[PDB]
């Protein structure tokens, strides 16, 4: 079903804009909002991982030298 | 740009010959390249640089 | 009550963080509410008045421009935004009493899914 | 009810039609006749070490021989068949006191 | 022609060599993890073994 | 209007199924980079099958030839190394952006409402990939192959009274032997065709309602045709997908594989290290940590059940992890486990790791039994969290 | 290592020559996709709506 | 008298295709 | 009070501010980048 | 109506194109049995895929094994034969049911407007069976089969220029041999779902306007639904071609072939008489008649030329034979000529079979040189018979 | 000809039946044919015009 | 009608699978 609209929208040319240099504009602020939003995911998806693996490693070597004469 | 525009842009069929040329030469230019690269950084180590090659008794 | 907020903090915490998520695109928690993903919904929306269909059909449509363009409402907008403001959820629960009311009398439904 | 009678009657072979060759296509992949023509003999075998296996061949089907020691078997003869999930002693399994024979192929998978 | 067998089938190879079968070398730099380290350290690898 | 004369071909009855299914087709306007790997799958379907076609031409389905035969494709044919690298790593781009596209599915809810469907049959595509690619992997006939092709089709035997009979009906004989390649062979030219129906299937199921879009909600009043602009910019993600996979081919051909394969199939010696590919690893590791035949199998099975049910779950009416906290974190944690579960697989069985696969494959199915609680429990936020 | 894999050094140079190649062609895709794109993330939307 | 014209270019491209798919260098 | 647009339709401007996250505009009247 | 609640199930989205183009679709009332081929048609493309692919679980397609391993099928497949004799026998029912399907065409003038996409189409269609069906003919690696791989693959040497390049790059190798067999084996499982796509486009060609009938007049106001009365009536010949195809593969499983391609391929003796199947002997005639290699080549692109343009040929408004008396006896004079062309084909190379197929021939390309005369001439025939 | 045919007798034995039970089928299909037709071919169709 | 028809339905299933799988000899 059609949605019925009341908007105004006014647009510019493509030949009259700069196309590339928005990419690194105001990259430290980027930087900023992808960790600040992010920090919580990364932890969750990046701990679980490391932690098992570091401790599996450490298992494995205390049974090493626990075989060993 | 507005010159080149003016002779390789301003028919399509034009435009891809154009975009047939600059196919063909870039792949060739590039090819060449690679291989002087490769050259320049094997020095020594070719088939053609044995010494002994053709010696084989 | 445990997702009272104001009786557990973690409740209060969620609140904050789902307010503030909403705020930064100027969306109502009910602008979440598809009438794609139920048929009571499309129904309470149809039974909304044409003012708060039109102000919700605008403020999805400036959020997915800011979506698109990577950018959240500037801060002035967004301290005059109202993102627990509710327009929808009376109406729903109304519609969803009346189906209850249809079954429970052996009724057919007013209105059903298609079948994808 | 008079049309319904002559209807059954050429379902029935419509029936069987679609199970005779639905039946077709799926024996078609069982063992062929020379796959089954090689699936009986018999070899013999040799000596070994007193504590080491050799691997010999059948159909498909490695088999295992394994001469045990005297505190092989005394380990081999001290497991409860309680606690054992298919509860079976040494002595059964084994025809001669110390040469262990068995196919050499996981029952798991 | 391909480079010739030096015995006649796997059989005459284990025989030759005490039951082993020596493999077949084409692509045994592929068939080992760290293949040419592998075969390097192999090779060069024969020692005393530990006490 | 009255079509007295032509207007736009694009509009004609020639073209105007494919116009409104791939030009005209209205999209929303805010899609990110992750709904670009539809597409990319669909590229790694074709490449498959056309790489395929050309490696058959010189392929023989003899236990005799085939090792041979895939040596003389490396060594002997033009571009073969070519040919033959870009179906091996090939399978292993395609699991890859199917894996992606799975994911955004499972992190934006885009299962839900009224798009459960479409993630049926992309339920199925996934099953029909899984034993396309098994049984590819088999033709090489290397140890890997040999000794995967026999468990796998030992796993029939955990039926209790007719396992047996299933195991030898899908060998032909007693044994993993000749008739298993030549029927493997056929199944493997076979599947990769119902693969191409089934996804026509899922994206004319998926076009009844359109696309989900990154904020879950009604996209009506800010859609797009989808070219040019999403052919743009799915074109920039094919770019790239072709730097990774040329990555993959040229310089490091052989990583995302195991030297065992290199050797020809064994019936005697069994490998001491025995793993599936990469991309089966999970499933591998989820049935290892049953101490049980029929328990393991079981497991398999339900994982797909879990993932069929899922859209069917009764659920809040929010869809996207960007405004469902707990749901994001959750799925953050299941990203996790599943990389646990794969790198699991590829250990021996032993300590520590058999308590680590348990307590994985736990945390899996955890997943899918709290999903829906969280969907119970949430229906009552908007009461409880009032302006 | 040469037996195992003959075509080595074939399969390097194509891969030098097509990655560079692939990556001009990345630039030139995201910027003929940003082009498409900036009529429409730099437009000026007007609506009714406040809260 | 453009679409003499435009034949003669697509014919153009089509040669300069035709000498790029094969490149008959070395038959020429 | 009069609704935005409303009053954009009303009121022509000649003085358009375009969005600048993404993309800045040449000065106008420049030459296209065709 | 507003659909609130669901009607019928077939009206629903998840059925309502099948309902719409295999269901309800409108059919002329008047159509008969001649117009219940093209079902025909798409059931032996199904019979040969099932049975190829069952086929291809046994079949290896090597020099040293092709031939053994098609007697391994005859003789050791638990069902071998009956796959076999089904595929091979199922080739020949598919060309009769095509042959009927395009005579039907050709009498009622199916070919003509709005139709002429859905007859070009069939062209394609055709050519697709005669390359897929002569491929598969090699894969027994017979006498025969090698011999009329090594006559169709030298056919590029017509080519001045490159025609020694294609015929080595067609052959992979300066002669027919294991490159030869393995890549017809690739190309001929492939084939088929092309021809199943094909077909596909063809039905929705034909349904954007419908069928035509044996009147060859409008018809939208006796239009009826297609199930269920035109499904009993092609059941009715699915059960007769059933019988038809029965007593083939039961009573006469060889007399379709030749005797020669159980002799295993011989590249040293030739067959003196080395013959291709009978639904390739009519262009196998037009080839022969010709004198000029070049010039047979010709001739058989010029008989696909003549097809495909057919229905463009300006002609009258009339479409039936029923009303078109003259075109009705060119009709039945082409057909006595296409089986005496193909009995022609049969016979070998020596007068006075030289001569006839060349008038053969000749009267086959006549059929389309006149049928546009006729056209122009009887557009005057409603101005010349009067009241 | 038993070496070179070794099915005959089961295929034979499988004609026969099959003949038999499609023929059976063939009879059933033409009743269910004309008895669906029946309605339409039976009908009396009234109309005004003559020429 | 909906106890009847599944006794039904499962009575036909039973029947089918007795008629296509046909293991006259594992009555055992
Ligand atoms: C990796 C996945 C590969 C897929 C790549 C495609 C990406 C994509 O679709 O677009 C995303 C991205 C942005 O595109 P977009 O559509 O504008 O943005 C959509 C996002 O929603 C934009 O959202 P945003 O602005 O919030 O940005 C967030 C963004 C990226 O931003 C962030 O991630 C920000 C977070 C930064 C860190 C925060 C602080 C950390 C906290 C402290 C320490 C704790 C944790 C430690 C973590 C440290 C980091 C390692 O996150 C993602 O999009 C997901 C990336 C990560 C997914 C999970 C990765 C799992 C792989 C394994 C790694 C870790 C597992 C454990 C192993 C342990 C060993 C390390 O892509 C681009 O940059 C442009 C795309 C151009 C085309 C590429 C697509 C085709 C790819 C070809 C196929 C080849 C394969
Ligand atoms: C031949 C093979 C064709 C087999 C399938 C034919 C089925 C079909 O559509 O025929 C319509 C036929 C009649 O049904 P219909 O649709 O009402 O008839 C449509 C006609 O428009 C009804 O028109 P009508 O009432 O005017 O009857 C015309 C009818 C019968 O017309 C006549 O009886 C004409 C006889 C008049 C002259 C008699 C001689 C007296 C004067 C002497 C001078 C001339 C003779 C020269 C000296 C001898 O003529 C034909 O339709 C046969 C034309 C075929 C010509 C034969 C050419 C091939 C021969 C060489 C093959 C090697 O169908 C049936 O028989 C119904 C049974 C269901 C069909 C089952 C099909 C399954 C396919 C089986 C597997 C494929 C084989
Ligand atoms: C014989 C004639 C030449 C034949 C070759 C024709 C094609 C040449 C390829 C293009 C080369 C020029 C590339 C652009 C140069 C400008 C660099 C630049 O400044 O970046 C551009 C954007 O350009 C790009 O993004 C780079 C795209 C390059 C595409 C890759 C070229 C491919 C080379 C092909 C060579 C053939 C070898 C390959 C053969 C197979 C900035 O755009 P804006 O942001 O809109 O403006 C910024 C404002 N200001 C001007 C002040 C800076
Ligand atoms: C393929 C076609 C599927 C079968 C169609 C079934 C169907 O529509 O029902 C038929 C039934 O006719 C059939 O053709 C039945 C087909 C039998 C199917 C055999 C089942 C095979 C078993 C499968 C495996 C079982 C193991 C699980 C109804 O026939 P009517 O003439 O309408 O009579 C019913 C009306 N009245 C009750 C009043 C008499
Ligand atoms: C694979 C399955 C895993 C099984 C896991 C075992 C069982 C655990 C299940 C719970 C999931 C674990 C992860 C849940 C925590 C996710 C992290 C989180 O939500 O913290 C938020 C903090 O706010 C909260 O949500 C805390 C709430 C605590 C829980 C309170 C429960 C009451 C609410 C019940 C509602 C139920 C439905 C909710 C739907 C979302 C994030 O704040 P923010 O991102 O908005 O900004 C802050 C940051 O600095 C910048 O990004
Ligand atoms: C109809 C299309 C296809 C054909 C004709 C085909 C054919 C082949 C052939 C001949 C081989 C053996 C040669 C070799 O090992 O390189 C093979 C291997 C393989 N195929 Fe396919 N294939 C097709 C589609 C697919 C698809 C869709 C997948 C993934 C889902 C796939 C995955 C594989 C894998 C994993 C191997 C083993 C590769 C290796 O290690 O060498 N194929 N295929
Ligand atoms: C060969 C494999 C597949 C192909 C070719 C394919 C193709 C596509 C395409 C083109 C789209 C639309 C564009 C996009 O969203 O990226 C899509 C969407 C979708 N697919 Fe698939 N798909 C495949 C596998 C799967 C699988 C395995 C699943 C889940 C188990 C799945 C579930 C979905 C869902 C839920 C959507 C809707 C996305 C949304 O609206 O946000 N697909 N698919
Ligand atoms: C794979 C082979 C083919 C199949 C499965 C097939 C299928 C069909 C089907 C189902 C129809 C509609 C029903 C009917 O009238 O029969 C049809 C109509 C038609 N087919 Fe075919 N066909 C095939 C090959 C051909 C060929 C080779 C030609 C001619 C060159 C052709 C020309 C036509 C024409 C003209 C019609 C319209 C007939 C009419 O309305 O009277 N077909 N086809
Ligand atoms: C995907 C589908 C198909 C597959 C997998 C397939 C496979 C095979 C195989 C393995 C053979 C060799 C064994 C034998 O000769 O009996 C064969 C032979 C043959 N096929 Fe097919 N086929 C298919 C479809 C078709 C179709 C559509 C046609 C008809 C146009 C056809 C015509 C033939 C012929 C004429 C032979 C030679 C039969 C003989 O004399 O022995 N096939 N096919
Ligand atoms: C060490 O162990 C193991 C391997 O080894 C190295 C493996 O690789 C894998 C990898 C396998 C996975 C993930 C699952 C494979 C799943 C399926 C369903 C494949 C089974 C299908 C087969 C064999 C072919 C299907 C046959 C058909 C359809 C017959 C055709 C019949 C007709 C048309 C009538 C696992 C788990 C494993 O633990
Ligand atoms: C708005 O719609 C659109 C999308 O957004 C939802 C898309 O995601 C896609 C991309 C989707 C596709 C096609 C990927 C699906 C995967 C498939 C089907 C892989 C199999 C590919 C083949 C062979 C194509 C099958 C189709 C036909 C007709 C066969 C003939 C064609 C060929 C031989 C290539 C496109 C183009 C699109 O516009
Ligand atoms: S096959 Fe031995 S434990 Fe799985």
Redesign the interface.
């Given at each position: 079903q059609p949605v019925k609209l009341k908007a105004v929208v006014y647009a510019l040319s493509p030949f009259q804009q700069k196309i590339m240099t928005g990419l690194w504009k105001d990259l430290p602020e980027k930087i900023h909002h992808k960790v600040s939003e992010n920090w919580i995911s990364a932890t969750l998806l990046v701990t679980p991982v490391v932690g098992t693996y570091w401790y599996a490693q450490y298992f494995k070597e205390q049974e090493k030298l626990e075989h060993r004469f | 740009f507005?010159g080149f525009?003016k002779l390789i842009m301003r028919?399509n069929?034009?435009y891809?010959?154009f975009i047939?040329?600059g196919?063909?030469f870039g792949?060739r230019a590039?090819?060449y390249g690679?291989?002087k690269?490769?050259e320049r950084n094997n020095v020594g180590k070719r088939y053609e640089d044995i010494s002994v090659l053709g010696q084989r008794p | 009550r445990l997702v009272d907020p104001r009786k557990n903090f973690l409740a209060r915490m969620h609140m904050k963080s789902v307010s503030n998520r909403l705020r930064r695109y100027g969306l109502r928690y009910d602008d979440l509410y598809d009438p794609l993903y139920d048929l009571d919904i499309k129904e309470a929306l149809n039974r909304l008045p044409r003012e708060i269909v039109d102000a919700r059909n605008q403020r999805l449509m400036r959020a997915m421009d800011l979506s698109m363009k990577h950018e959240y409402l500037p801060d002035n907008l967004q301290a005059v935004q109202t993102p627990f403001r509710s327009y929808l959820q009376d109406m729903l629960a109304l519609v969803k009493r009346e189906r209850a009311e249809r079954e429970a009398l052996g009724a057919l439904p007013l209105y059903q899914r298609t079948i994808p | 009810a008079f049309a319904y009678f002559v209807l059954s009657g050429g379902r029935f072979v419509y029936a069987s039609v679609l199970r005779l060759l639905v039946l077709k296509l799926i024996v078609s992949m069982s063992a062929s006749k020379d796959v089954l023509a090689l699936a009986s003999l018999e070899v013999d075998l040799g000596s070994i070490e007193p504590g080491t296996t050799v691997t010999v061949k059948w159909r498909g089907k490695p088999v295992f021989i394994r001469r045990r020691t005297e505190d092989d078997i005394k380990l081999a003869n001290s497991v409860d068949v309680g606690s054992l999930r298919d509860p079976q002693e040494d002595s059964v399994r084994v025809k001669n006191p110390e040469w262990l024979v068995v196919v050499g192929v996981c029952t798991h998978l | 022609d391909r480079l010739p067998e030096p015995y006649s089938n796997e059989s005459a190879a284990r025989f030759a060599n005490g039951g082993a079968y020596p493999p077949d070398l084409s692509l045994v730099t592929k068939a080992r993890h760290n293949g040419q380290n592998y075969v390097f350290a192999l090779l060069t690898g024969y020692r005393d073994p530990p006490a | 209007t009255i079509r007295n004369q032509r207007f736009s071909l694009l509009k004609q009855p020639i073209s105007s199924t494919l116009n409104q299914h791939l030009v005209d087709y209205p999209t929303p306007s805010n899609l990110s980079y992750w709904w670009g790997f539809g597409s990319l799958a669909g590229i790694c379907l074709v490449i498959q099958i056309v790489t395929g076609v050309f490696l058959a031409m010189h392929y023989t389905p003899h236990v005799d030839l085939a090792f041979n035969s895939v040596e003389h494709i490396m060594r002997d044919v033009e571009g073969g190394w070519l040919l033959r690298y870009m179906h091996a790593n090939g399978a292993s781009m395609f699991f890859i952006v199917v894996y992606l596209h799975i994911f955004r599915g499972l992190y934006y809810a885009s299962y839900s409402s009224p798009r459960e469907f479409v993630w049926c049959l992309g339920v199925v595509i996934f099953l029909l990939m899984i034993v396309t690619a098994f049984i590819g992997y088999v033709l090489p006939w290397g140890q890997m192959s040999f000794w995967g092709a026999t468990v796998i089709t030992s796993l029939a035997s955990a039926i209790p009274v007719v396992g047996d009979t299933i195991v030898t009906w899908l060998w032909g004989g007693f044994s993993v032997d000749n008739a298993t390649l030549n029927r493997f062979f056929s199944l493997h030219y076979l599947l990769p065709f119902i693969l191409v129906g089934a996804s026509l299937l899922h994206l004319a199921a998926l076009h009844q309602y359109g696309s989900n879009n990154p904020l879950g909600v009604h996209s009506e009043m800010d859609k797009i045709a989808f070219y040019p602009y999403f052919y743009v910019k799915d074109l920039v993600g094919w770019v790239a997908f072709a730097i990774f996979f040329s990555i993959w081919i040229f310089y490091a051909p052989n990583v995302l594989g195991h030297p065992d394969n290199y050797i020809p199939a064994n019936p005697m010696s069994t490998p001491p290290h025995i793993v599936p590919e990469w991309y089966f690893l999970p499933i591998y590791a989820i049935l290892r940590s049953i101490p049980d035949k029929a328990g393991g199998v079981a497991a398999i099975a339900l994982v797909f059940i879990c993932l069929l049910a899922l859209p069917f779950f009764k659920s809040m009416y929010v869809r996207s992890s960007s405004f469902r906290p707990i749901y994001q974190g959750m799925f953050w944690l299941l990203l996790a486990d599943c990389l646990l579960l794969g790198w699991i697989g590829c250990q021996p069985v032993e300590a520590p790791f058999v308590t680590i696969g348990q307590i994985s494959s736990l945390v899996f199915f955890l997943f899918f039994a709290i999903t829906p609680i969280l969907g119970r429990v949430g229906r009552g936020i908007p009461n409880s969290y009032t302006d | 290592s040469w037996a195992a894999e003959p075509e080595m050094e074939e399969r390097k140079?194509m891969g030098?020559?097509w990655i560079?190649?692939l990556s001009l062609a990345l630039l030139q895709a995201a910027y003929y996709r940003r082009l498409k794109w900036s009529v429409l993330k730099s437009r000026k939307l007007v609506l009714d709506v406040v809260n | 008298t453009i679409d003499i014209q435009?034949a003669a270019?697509?014919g153009?491209?089509a040669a300069?295709?035709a000498i790029?798919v094969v490149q008959p260098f070395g038959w020429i | 009070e009069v609704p935005a647009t409303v009053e954009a339709v009303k009121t022509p401007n000649s003085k358009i501010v375009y969005d600048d996250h993404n993309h800045e505009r040449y000065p106008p009247g420049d030459?296209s980048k065709?």
């Amino acid at each position: 079903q059609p949605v019925k609209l009341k908007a105004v929208v006014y647009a510019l040319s493509p030949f009259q804009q700069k196309i590339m240099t928005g990419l690194w504009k105001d990259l430290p602020e980027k930087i900023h909002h992808k960790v600040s939003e992010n920090w919580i995911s990364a932890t969750l998806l990046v701990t679980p991982v490391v932690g098992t693996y570091w401790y599996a490693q450490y298992f494995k070597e205390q049974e090493k030298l626990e075989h060993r004469f | 740009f507005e010159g080149f525009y003016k002779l390789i842009m301003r028919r399509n069929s034009v435009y891809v010959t154009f975009i047939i040329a600059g196919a063909f030469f870039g792949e060739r230019a590039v090819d060449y390249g690679v291989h002087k690269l490769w050259e320049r950084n094997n020095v020594g180590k070719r088939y053609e640089d044995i010494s002994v090659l053709g010696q084989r008794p | 009550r445990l997702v009272d907020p104001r009786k557990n903090f973690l409740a209060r915490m969620h609140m904050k963080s789902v307010s503030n998520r909403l705020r930064r695109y100027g969306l109502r928690y009910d602008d979440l509410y598809d009438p794609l993903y139920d048929l009571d919904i499309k129904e309470a929306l149809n039974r909304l008045p044409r003012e708060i269909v039109d102000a919700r059909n605008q403020r999805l449509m400036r959020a997915m421009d800011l979506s698109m363009k990577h950018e959240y409402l500037p801060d002035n907008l967004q301290a005059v935004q109202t993102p627990f403001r509710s327009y929808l959820q009376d109406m729903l629960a109304l519609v969803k009493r009346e189906r209850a009311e249809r079954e429970a009398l052996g009724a057919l439904p007013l209105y059903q899914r298609t079948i994808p | 009810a008079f049309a319904y009678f002559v209807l059954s009657g050429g379902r029935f072979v419509y029936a069987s039609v679609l199970r005779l060759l639905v039946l077709k296509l799926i024996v078609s992949m069982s063992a062929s006749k020379d796959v089954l023509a090689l699936a009986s003999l018999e070899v013999d075998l040799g000596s070994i070490e007193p504590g080491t296996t050799v691997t010999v061949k059948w159909r498909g089907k490695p088999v295992f021989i394994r001469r045990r020691t005297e505190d092989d078997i005394k380990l081999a003869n001290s497991v409860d068949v309680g606690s054992l999930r298919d509860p079976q002693e040494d002595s059964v399994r084994v025809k001669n006191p110390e040469w262990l024979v068995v196919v050499g192929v996981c029952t798991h998978l | 022609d391909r480079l010739p067998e030096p015995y006649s089938n796997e059989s005459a190879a284990r025989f030759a060599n005490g039951g082993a079968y020596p493999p077949d070398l084409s692509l045994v730099t592929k068939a080992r993890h760290n293949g040419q380290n592998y075969v390097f350290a192999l090779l060069t690898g024969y020692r005393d073994p530990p006490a | 209007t009255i079509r007295n004369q032509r207007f736009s071909l694009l509009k004609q009855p020639i073209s105007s199924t494919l116009n409104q299914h791939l030009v005209d087709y209205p999209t929303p306007s805010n899609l990110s980079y992750w709904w670009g790997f539809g597409s990319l799958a669909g590229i790694c379907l074709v490449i498959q099958i056309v790489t395929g076609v050309f490696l058959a031409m010189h392929y023989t389905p003899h236990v005799d030839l085939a090792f041979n035969s895939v040596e003389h494709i490396m060594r002997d044919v033009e571009g073969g190394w070519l040919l033959r690298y870009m179906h091996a790593n090939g399978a292993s781009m395609f699991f890859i952006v199917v894996y992606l596209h799975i994911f955004r599915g499972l992190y934006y809810a885009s299962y839900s409402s009224p798009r459960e469907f479409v993630w049926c049959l992309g339920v199925v595509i996934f099953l029909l990939m899984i034993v396309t690619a098994f049984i590819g992997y088999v033709l090489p006939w290397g140890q890997m192959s040999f000794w995967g092709a026999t468990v796998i089709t030992s796993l029939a035997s955990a039926i209790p009274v007719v396992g047996d009979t299933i195991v030898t009906w899908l060998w032909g004989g007693f044994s993993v032997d000749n008739a298993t390649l030549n029927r493997f062979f056929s199944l493997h030219y076979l599947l990769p065709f119902i693969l191409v129906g089934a996804s026509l299937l899922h994206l004319a199921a998926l076009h009844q309602y359109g696309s989900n879009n990154p904020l879950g909600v009604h996209s009506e009043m800010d859609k797009i045709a989808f070219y040019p602009y999403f052919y743009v910019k799915d074109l920039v993600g094919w770019v790239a997908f072709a730097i990774f996979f040329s990555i993959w081919i040229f310089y490091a051909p052989n990583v995302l594989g195991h030297p065992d394969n290199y050797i020809p199939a064994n019936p005697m010696s069994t490998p001491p290290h025995i793993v599936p590919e990469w991309y089966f690893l999970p499933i591998y590791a989820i049935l290892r940590s049953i101490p049980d035949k029929a328990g393991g199998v079981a497991a398999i099975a339900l994982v797909f059940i879990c993932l069929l049910a899922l859209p069917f779950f009764k659920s809040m009416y929010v869809r996207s992890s960007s405004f469902r906290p707990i749901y994001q974190g959750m799925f953050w944690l299941l990203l996790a486990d599943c990389l646990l579960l794969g790198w699991i697989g590829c250990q021996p069985v032993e300590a520590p790791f058999v308590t680590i696969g348990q307590i994985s494959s736990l945390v899996f199915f955890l997943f899918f039994a709290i999903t829906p609680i969280l969907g119970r429990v949430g229906r009552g936020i908007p009461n409880s969290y009032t302006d | 290592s040469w037996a195992a894999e003959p075509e080595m050094e074939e399969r390097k140079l194509m891969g030098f020559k097509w990655i560079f190649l692939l990556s001009l062609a990345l630039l030139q895709a995201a910027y003929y996709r940003r082009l498409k794109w900036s009529v429409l993330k730099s437009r000026k939307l007007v609506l009714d709506v406040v809260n | 008298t453009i679409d003499i014209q435009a034949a003669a270019g697509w014919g153009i491209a089509a040669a300069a295709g035709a000498i790029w798919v094969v490149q008959p260098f070395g038959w020429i | 009070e009069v609704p935005a647009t409303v009053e954009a339709v009303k009121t022509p401007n000649s003085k358009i501010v375009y969005d600048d996250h993404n993309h800045e505009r040449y000065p106008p009247g420049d030459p296209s980048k065709r």
